[PDB]
């Protein structure tokens, strides 16, 4: 059958980590996404992963709309599909973070969705639990998405060009998981690295990240 998200894939009994095909809501356009079926009860649709810096994230507005990368590794699932899903029903957002010394942390948001394209894919987040900080490193109320061409941020600057990525940037706010990747002994003092302020401060660049969504019914 078609499946809209990895939680349906899981309930059909495909309880194994892998790439699966998902269908746009009320349509026949297909997308391929990684499903995490073993962490936290499974059913997690990965929407972003960073691991090794093999993939550039300085992409245009159209690429962030469609998606880019490889679902086997570092990739962005695409704002359009995520906007179509998260406006159909309540999704949670879990963010998983690793540093170079070997620590783990996460943030959980009990409601996430994206506005439509005419509202520049603005983020909405509600609730916050977990260990990667007790204040949301994504600014609230959520900002418009911004990219090296689409300057929708509150800075008089171009945040996407100073911080080299596509993000809901503010001016320019406490986080950017789509920033530059810095390897094993260059990750400190990097203002444009993979940033999550309320866990490792500014200038520290993270080792790995994963953003993933699941229905709050699950």
């Amino acid at each position: 059958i078609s499946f809209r998200d990895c939680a349906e894939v899981f309930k059909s009994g495909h309880t194994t980590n892998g790439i699966y095909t998902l269908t746009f809501p009320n349509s026949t356009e297909e997308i391929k996404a990684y499903c995490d079926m073993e962490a936290g009860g499974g059913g997690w649709t990965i929407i972003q992963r960073r691991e090794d810096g093999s993939v550039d994230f300085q992409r245009t507005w159209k690429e962030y709309k469609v998606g880019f990368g490889n679902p086997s590794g570092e990739y962005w699932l695409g704002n359009e599909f995520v906007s179509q899903l998260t406006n159909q029903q309540r999704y949670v957002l879990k963010i998983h973070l690793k540093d170079w010394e070997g620590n783990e942390a996460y943030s959980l948001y009990e409601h996430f969705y994206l506005s439509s394209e005419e509202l520049n894919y603005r983020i909405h987040l509600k609730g916050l639990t977990g260990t990667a900080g007790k204040i949301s490193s994504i600014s609230q109320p959520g900002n418009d998405f911004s990219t090296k061409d689409g300057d929708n941020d509150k800075c008089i600057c171009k945040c996407s060009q100073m911080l080299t990525g596509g993000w809901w940037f503010d001016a320019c706010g406490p986080s950017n998981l789509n920033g530059m990747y810095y390897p094993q002994r260059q990750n400190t003092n990097k203002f444009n690295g993979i940033k999550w302020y309320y866990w490792k401060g500014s200038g520290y660049s993270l080792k790995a990240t994963t953003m993933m969504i699941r229905p709050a019914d699950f």
Partner: antibody
Amino acid sequence: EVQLVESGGGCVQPGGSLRLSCAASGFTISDYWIHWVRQAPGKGLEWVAGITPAGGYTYYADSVKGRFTISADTSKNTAYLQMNSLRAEDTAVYYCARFVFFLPYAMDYWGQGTCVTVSS
Amino acid sequence: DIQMTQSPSSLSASVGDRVTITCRASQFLSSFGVAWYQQKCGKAPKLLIYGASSLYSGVPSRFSGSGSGTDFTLTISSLQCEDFATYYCQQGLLSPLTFGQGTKVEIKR
């Protein structure tokens, strides 16, 4: 060398009007922001306005918004501040400054300043 | 608007002493956007430090800065008679571009 040279300050009546001119030398203003900063007698620095000449975007402090108007004239590499409905509070030294919007991200060069005295 | 509050409005210290100026923002500021300026009697200001902590060219290495988020600091590691000036923080990020109130350094002799 890089210079900014502002000119056209003076004495003017309250309610009067005046036009400061900041001439830039050694750089093309289109590649940087031009900002005006003022210092009232004995007071701190107040930021007045700024312009992006490659785009015409303009910004104003609340104190002057809708009274002053910053503009730029790339064919003369020059920036202007038209001042209208002047008041005693507008008495200050006015400096134009180059703002570098790439990595130094600061006002690295400043003009010498020009005096405006608003007094009957 | 973003309010920039400098905690000592003036300080007086002897030649050799170490002094620090603390500037506090009301909102998270990206540290690349914070700068410090020095002004001396009847002069235009000059840039000392950019990006919260980077020393500008030709500034004496006794100046240094640090901070992130809301809290930023300017240090003179050993005060010299020529450091008599007023020092201003600024945020260059969200319009309008507020300066701090300034801090005056007086030198004991």
